[PDB]
Design a protein around this ligand. Structure first.
Ligand SMILES: Cc1noc(C)c1-c1ccc2c(c1)nc(CCc1ccc(OCCCN(C)C)cc1)n2CCN1CCN(CC(=O)NCCOc2cccc3c2C(=O)N([C@@H]2CCC(=O)NC2=O)C3=O)CC1
Length: 126
């Protein structure tokens, strides 16, 4: 019906940090995840108005998308890698929660999540 405001990507009161693990996650996003053929539905907040999904934000109370994550990394919004990993997990589980097994969008999220999990298993030490 109306879209909510998107998740913040900067906040003057939230401590900001650059770490080698967060740099690695930014590289994973820019070099791999953002360019993936299934990235497009996840590159920006779900536009429930344009997609005619009036129930989306009744069901999804913690929205997250890869455009927000990318901007958070680019703005040094995160303090640690775990915060970014959590945002990815929120993004994928939101897709599974709103949709139904076998939906095309769920298959896309599953492939992106599997690739992301591969990259997380190669996360460097701090
Ligand atoms: C996540 C998630 N979790 O749960 C849900 C639900 C979702 C979810 C979220 C978003 C979804 C989404 C699902 N599905 C879509 C669009 C699906 C769609 C709709 C109509 C269509 O074609 C209609 C053809 C005419 N009919 C008579 C058949 C093609 C795809 N979208 C919207 C995708 N939007 C694509 C456009 N983007 C703005 C933009 O300019 N981005 C540039 C990249 O555009 C890309 C990149 C890759 C692939 C496609 C696009 C793109 O615009 N389309 C199509 C083109 C036709 C069209 O009307 N819409 C599209 O999205 C693609 O198939 C904004 C986002």
């Amino acid at each position: 019906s109306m879209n909510p405001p998107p998740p913040e990507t900067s906040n003057p009161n939230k401590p900001k940090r650059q770490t080698n693990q967060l740099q690695y996650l930014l590289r994973v996003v820019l070099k791999t995840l953002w360019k993936h053929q299934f990235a497009w539905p996840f590159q920006q907040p779900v536009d429930a108005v344009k997609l005619n999904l009036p129930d989306y934000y009744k069901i999804i109370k913690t929205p997250m998308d890869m455009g927000t994550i990318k901007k958070r990394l680019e703005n040094n919004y995160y303090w640690n890698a775990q915060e970014c990993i959590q945002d990815f997990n929120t993004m994928f589980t939101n897709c599974y929660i709103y949709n139904k097994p076998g939906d095309d969008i769920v298959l896309m999220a599953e492939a992106l999540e599997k690739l992301f999990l591969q990259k997380i298993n190669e996360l460097p030490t701090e």
